[PDB]
């Protein structure tokens, strides 16, 4: 199955 | 470690 | 149909 | 700043 | 500001 | 298919 | 108006 | 090696 | 490890 | 405007 | 540091 | 119609 993997960073 | 998805279906 | 689920794992 | 990442996958 | 949207389709 | 549509604006 | 069109394609 | 295609569209 | 970082600036 | 930077880091 | 922007015109 | 612009910036 077919998944997006999010992310954030703080810079 | 969290890691945050989105499922995509096709139903 | 198509639909999104929010999905946030512990890994 | 925010940055956003992103990937695609299969599982 | 800056904001985002989305919706998920069907073709 | 699949398909999302992003709308990215300045308010 | 202009949006930003993802296709996953599955391959 | 499932992938995002993106562009961008007139509706 | 590399990171594709995305982000959205008002001009 | 709204203008989207795209940036490949090396960590 | 190297970055790529993008932004969208509709004429 | 729509354009999309491209640039590359030394920031
Ligand atoms: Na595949």
Same mark, same amino acid.
């Not at 199955?1 to 810079?11: H, Q």
């Given at each position: @199955? !077919? @998944? !997006?993997?999010?992310? +954030?960073?703080? +810079?």
């Amino acid at each position: @199955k !077919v @998944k !997006v993997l999010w992310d +954030v960073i703080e +810079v």
